Amino acid sequence: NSQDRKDLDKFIKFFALKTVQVIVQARLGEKICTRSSSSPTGSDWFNLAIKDIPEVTHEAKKALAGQLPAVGRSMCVEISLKTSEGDSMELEIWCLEMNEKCDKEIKVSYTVYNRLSLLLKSLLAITRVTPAYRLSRKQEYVILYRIYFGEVQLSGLGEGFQTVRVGTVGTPVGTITLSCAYR
């Protein structure tokens, strides 16, 4: 069980690293396009071609501080807008929680691994069908991103924000939940 969780920690770590890439690249103003490979490389996580932006990797690792989501401790990617006036506005908070309840029957490694791959595919899809997407590409305005870690605070979204469930994946340590709250 010790190796399996060492593997699962790695899977969750790189899932979190990769969701931050997907979310930020989708708020990047330009279209994203990667290529499949029948002869892949050893760093195509979850059988998906997601190019890491170093600077984004940096503060994904500074935010996590070498830690992983858990109880009451959930990773958040905040997409914001600074206008010509300079007043900030919280557009979306992307939330990767790690619920308490577990799935002791789900067989690590690659059941979880393959289901996290599907969730990154769901995340690629949902990241283009929220209003902050079309806003981030129609470019006057600028988009800001920021990653932090703990309890989630939805206050800057304003009263009445909507939420989108991206999906969930159950693991023996708890079930991951990926969602978004946006104004």
Next chain:
Amino acid sequence: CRSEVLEVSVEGRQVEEAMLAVLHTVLLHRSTGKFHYAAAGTYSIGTVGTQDVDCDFIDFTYVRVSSEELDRALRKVVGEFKDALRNSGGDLGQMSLEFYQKKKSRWPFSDECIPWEVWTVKVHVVALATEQERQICREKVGEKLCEKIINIVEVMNRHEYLPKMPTQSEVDNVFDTGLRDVQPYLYKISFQITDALGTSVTTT
């Protein structure tokens, strides 16, 4: 075998992109990297690429797997539906995307195609007459397609059932291994121009 039905009300020119948006979204979730088997029975899994598709007739962008041949296959049968829709008229069509496994059967009976999941997108085409028609339509169906993709993701995340991983000989009973850059689950795309059925009882 589970079924999901979606409806879109779209202008005539936007029917192709709206369908590609639905089909690709489903197939992105219903495919994996290609399998390369070893004689020992193990296999490696290739990498899937994805790319953004900007719609012109709709203010909308979807994500499809970067296979150029899969896109050509769907654009073709989407065009078959497009042509059939305009050849017919009035009392309106629907396209279906179904996933199935191939089961072996004793001679003489040929192999059984057993659906585990089917998607039907019913299409209502509306006619437009000013230019404000076209522009506000470009906005309106884009917002509608956002709802659809969100609903597709939220049924896809149910993790209801999926066929078990095939062995080297069973692979062509579960996957479409005929493509270069992705192996979808074995799928079938048929369409159908239906009639319009009224409504009986309120139930007020």
